[PDB]
RNA sequence: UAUUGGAGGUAGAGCACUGUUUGGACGAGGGGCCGGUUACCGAAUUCAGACAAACUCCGAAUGCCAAUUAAUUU
RNA sequence: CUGGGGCGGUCGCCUCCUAAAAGGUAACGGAGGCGCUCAAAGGUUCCCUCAGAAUGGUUGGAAAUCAUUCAUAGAGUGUAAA
RNA sequence: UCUGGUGACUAUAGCAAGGAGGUCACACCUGUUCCCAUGCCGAACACAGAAGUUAAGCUCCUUAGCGUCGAUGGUAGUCGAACUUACGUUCCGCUAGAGUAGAACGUUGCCAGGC
C-alpha cells in the first residue's frame, strides 16, 4: 500500500478535499474497523506506519485489510527556486480521505485487542478517527 | 458419386436408426472438406509454394489458393500478406470420389496402429489430421517430389459434434 | 412485530425532513402487492426493537390508519457518522 | 527568473467555433449552418446536407428541428411551411 | 514528390497543375482533362 | 460444423443498405421486388406516407401459368406497368431488393421500361 | 472451377478387391477397358488396403 | 420573467471502455522435477471492494440558442 | 517573451486536457504531432466483414497458414490526438 | 387475428430455453443445359426444376434465466438568499446517479391473397 506501479499521467492536478466519502463507508471484510471524521491527504509513509503499529499489537493474530490506497501523485518544486519554469517533480503518493471513510479493517482477533490496535494506528495518522464494528441489523 | 450411391443405400439406411431421427433431412450429411496445405517456411523459398501448388492441383483436381498471411509474424519471415499454404474445397461428387480414394489408399502407406486416426479432433466434429504426404499419391510417385508437409484436413458435416463424426467414420474409415 | 406509523404530507421540504430526524423520527415508504405507494414515517427507537426482535426478515404488522399491513423490509438507509437511520423501504406480501 | 529549467509543452492550436449555430424553432434560410462538427455527432435528415468538413447545412428555407434517430443518435431536419 | 503541369496535347495550353512522385511515376503522367479552349476532354501530359 | 441459412436475411441486410438512397415519394414512387424460390412480387410504394399504390406477383391468378420464372417475371413487370399507368405513375425508382440486378429482377425491370414506367 | 485441372473417376482395378471406386489425375493407359468400372487406367496395381491391415490382416 | 422546444457531458455518481487498485473463490501455462506431479508464478474466469483533469453505460442545477407566443419594462 | 536582467528554453500551424455540460478563455500550465504522403491510400459500380478467445492441431518460437462457435467491435481507418 | 410483402417506432421489441406447426404462401431441397458464377468452391451467385421434407431456417404459443425498461421515497449535488472563514452552517427552489418495487417474451400502418 505504498505506490501505484504505473500511472498514465504523472503530474496530476491536486485532488478536491471538500465533500463526503464517495464510498467505502462500510466494513465489508473485517469485524471492527476504523473510519475518519475529518479530511486530509494520507500519504504512503503514514499508512505504512499506522500499519506497523496496529500489527505489532495484534501479534500476528488476526488479519488486516487496508482500505485506502495511495493513488495520487504530488509534486514539490526543488529548493530555493523562483516561481515559474514548469511543474516540479513527484515527491510522494497520496489518497484523499474525507469524513466517513473507513481506513482499516480487522478480524480474527478479540474486540478489545482490535480497538487497541486501531487506537495505536490512529495516532500515526493525520485525521480524526472513530472505532466501528461490522454494521448489521 | 460412388460414395453418394452408397450414402443413399447404406448410410441413409444405417445411420437413420443408429440414432433415432424423424425426417430424412435430420440425417448427417458430409458437406465438404478443406485441404489447406498448412504452412511451409517459404520465406527464403517461393518455389515450395509451387511444389504445393502443383501438389494440390494434382492431388485434388483443382487449383489451390495461396492465402497470404493475415498478421505480421516474427520468428519466420511472414510479413503482412506473405504467401503461404493452399486450401482446396471439395463439395460435389469430388468430395466422394476423393474420400473413397483415401480409404482405398490409407492402409498401404499410413503405417498406423490401432486405427488410422484417433481422438485427433477439435472437439466439434472436424478432423484436423496431418499426413506427411504418406498415402496421398497413387497417381504420381514420391519420385517426382521434394518437400515434406502435412496436408491438413477437417470435416464439414451437418453432424453436430465429433461424437457423431465417429459414427460417420464408420463410413468406410477407421475410428 | 406490531409497529405503527404516521402519515406524512405532500411537499416535505429539506427543513421538514431534517427536523423529523432530530425528533427521533425516521421517514419511509411502502409498496408492493396488495397496496399502493404510501409514504409514512416511523419512530426509530421502536423500529430497531422490532428488527432485533424478528431480525432481518419478518412478516411485520404495520400501523397505517386503521389497516394493518403484513410487510417486510425490502431494504434500508443509514448514516455511518452520527449513527442514525435514514429511510426504510417496505414491501407487502399478504 | 529561475534559470535553465524549461518545459516541453507550451503549445496549442486555435479553437474552431464548432457546436450549434441555429436552435429549434427559428427560420433559417437555405445554406445556413446548423451544426459544425467532426465525424457525425448529428447526421443530416430531411432537406439537410453533409459538407466535406462534416458541416451540416439546410438544403432549403424553413424551420429547423433536432430529433432522435435510433437509441443514441441524433439527426436534423428542415421543414418549409412558413 | 514534385509539382507537375499538364498541357493539352492538342491545344498546347498548360491548363492544370498537380503533384507526382518522381520515383513511383518516373514518367510524363498523362490524364484526360477539359481544355476550356477546345470545350472538350483532350489528353493532357506533364511538361 | 457449419450452418446453412435461408438467403433472405442476408438479402434484407443489403436491402437496408440500398434503401438508404432509394426512397419513394408521391411523384417518384419505389418499385420493390421480393424473389422467392418459386415466385417474384413487386409493389409501387410512396415512403413519405407509407402507402402501396400498386402491386403484382407471379402468384396473382392473372399472371400464374407455366413458364421459366424469368419468363413470368417478364409478366409481373408488364402488369405492374399497367396498374401504375391507371393511377398516373410515370417515373419510378427501381429498388432491386437486395438482389443483384440480373436474371429475374432484371427481367422484371426491363419489362416495365419496355411497357411505360420511365426509369 | 473456371480453369480447373483434369480429374476423372478412373477404375482403380487393383488385384486386391479391384477397388475401382476412386478418381484422380492418373489418366494412364487403360490396360483393362472394363465396363463395370471406369474404362480408364487401373493405375492401382498392388497395395495392402484390401489385403493386409494391422488390425484385420 | 412565465411557458414550450433543443445543442452540450461540468458537479455528482458509476466501473460498461482505457486504465489504476484491495481481499476471496477457481482450474490451469513456462516451471520446482523427470511432458511433468506440488508449490507457485504469468495470466484466463469469477464474487465482493475501491480511485481518475486529459475514464464514461449515466447525468443534474444553472447558463446558452430560439420560438405559435403572453405579461411588465424601455 | 522572461515572476529583475543575464544563461537556458520559446516564437507559425494541428489535436487533447486545464476550460466551470453553447461559444470563447491565460500562465516559462499538463501531453503529443506538422513543414508531408496517395496515379491509387482519388471518382463511381458491384461485392465482402473484423481483433482476440478456447473447444487444436502438418508447423506448433506460444499464437506463422489452416479449422469452428462466440465474438459490438475489444479490429482496421497512410500519419498526432480527438 | 392469421399468411406473405413493405414503411413506423429508444430491445417493454432482444437472447435463450421449452412446446407446436406447415394450408401450398415460405424455406430446405434437386440438378448445371442455359443467362450466369468467382478468387477459392453451383458454396455463394445466377439459373432450370420439384421427387422429397417439417428436419432445420421461419411462424405461432409458453418462461423473466439473461439482456432491456424503471418510478415512489430518501440521499448527493446545486440556482438564489442569509450567516459566516468554517475542508462550513441555515432557509428556499430544482433535483440526480446507484439501488428497490415493478414493467415487459412488442406494438404497428399499407398492400395482396386468406377466414
UniProtKB/Swiss-Prot annotation, chain A:
Record's keyword annotation contains Ribonucleoprotein: yes
Q: Where is this region: Disordered?
A: 1-23
Entry's Gene Ontology cellular component terms: cytosolic large ribosomal subunit
A GO molecular function term, named singly, is: rRNA binding
UniProt entry keywords in alphabetical sequence: Ribonucleoprotein, Ribosomal protein, RNA-binding, rRNA-binding, tRNA-binding
Specify one Pfam family: Ribosomal_L16
Q: Which Gene3D superfamilies does the UniProt entry name for this protein?
A: Ribosomal protein L10e/L16
Tell me the Gene Ontology biological-process terms attached to this UniProt entry. Answer: translation
Composition bias of kind Basic residues appears in: 1-19
Q: Does the keyword Zinc apply?
A: no
Query: Self-association or partners: how does it assemble?
Result: Part of the 50S ribosomal subunit.
Annotated family = Belongs to the universal ribosomal protein uL16 family.
Instruction: Summarize the protein's role.
Output: Binds 23S rRNA and is also seen to make contacts with the A and possibly P site tRNAs.
- The protein's name is Large ribosomal subunit protein uL16
The top of its lineage is: Bacteria, Bacillati, Bacillota, Bacilli, Bacillales
Swiss-Prot record, chain B:
Q: Which Gene3D superfamilies match?
A: 3.30.1440.10
Q: SUPFAM superfamilies this protein is in?
A: RL5-like
A single GO cellular-component term on record: ribonucleoprotein complex
One Pfam family it belongs to:
Ribosomal_L5
Keyword terms, alphabetized = Ribonucleoprotein, Ribosomal protein, RNA-binding, rRNA-binding, tRNA-binding
Show the InterPro entries listed in the entry: Ribosomal_uL5 (IPR002132), Ribosomal_uL5_bac-type (IPR020930), Ribosomal_uL5_C (IPR031309), Ribosomal_uL5_CS (IPR020929), Ribosomal_uL5_dom_sf (IPR022803), Ribosomal_uL5_N (IPR031310)
Keyword tRNA-binding among UniProt keywords: yes
**Gene Ontology biological process terms from the UniProt entry:** translation
Q: Where is the signal peptide?
A: none
From the Swiss-Prot or TrEMBL record, what is one GO molecular function term? rRNA binding
The protein's role, per its UniProt record: This is one of the proteins that bind and probably mediate the attachment of the 5S RNA into the large ribosomal subunit, where it forms part of the central protuberance. In the 70S ribosome it contacts protein S13 of the 30S subunit (bridge B1b), connecting the 2 subunits; this bridge is implicated in subunit movement. Contacts the P site tRNA; the 5S rRNA and some of its associated proteins might help stabilize positioning of ribosome-bound tRNAs.
Under the subunit heading, UniProt states:
Part of the 50S ribosomal subunit; part of the 5S rRNA/L5/L18/L25 subcomplex. Contacts the 5S rRNA and the P site tRNA. Forms a bridge to the 30S subunit in the 70S ribosome.
**Family that this chain belongs to:** Belongs to the universal ribosomal protein uL5 family.
PANTHER family in the record: 60S RIBOSOMAL PROTEIN L11-RELATED
- Annotated protein name in UniProt: Large ribosomal subunit protein uL5
Q: Which organism is it from?
A: Staphylococcus aureus (strain MW2)
From Swiss-Prot, chain D:
In alphabetical order, the GO MF annotations are: structural constituent of ribosome
Q: Superkingdom of this entry's organism?
A: Bacteria
One GO cellular component term, please give it: cytosolic large ribosomal subunit
**Has the keyword Transferase been applied to this entry?**
no
Q: Which InterPro entries match?
A: Ribosomal_bL27, Ribosomal_bL27_CS
PTM description: The N-terminus is cleaved by ribosomal processing cysteine protease Prp.
Q: What Pfam families is this protein classified in?
A: Ribosomal_L27
Its BP terms in the Gene Ontology are: translation
For this protein, the record's NCBIfam families field holds:
L27
* UniProt protein name: Large ribosomal subunit protein bL27
Q: Which gene encodes it?
A: rpmA
Swiss-Prot record, chain G:
Report the leader peptide range: none
Keyword annotations:
Ribonucleoprotein, Ribosomal protein
What family, per the record? Belongs to the bacterial ribosomal protein bL31 family. Type B subfamily.
Question: Can you state the subunit structure given in the record?
Answer: Part of the 50S ribosomal subunit.
Q: Extract one GO cellular component term from the record.
A: ribonucleoprotein complex
What gene does the UniProt entry assign to this protein? rpmE2
GO MF terms, alphabetically ordered? structural constituent of ribosome
**Which is a GO BP term held by this UniProt record?**
translation
| UniProt protein name | Large ribosomal subunit protein bL31B
Could you tell me which species this protein originates from? Answer: Staphylococcus aureus (strain MW2)
Give the stretch of the parent protein shown, with its full length: 3 to 59 of 84
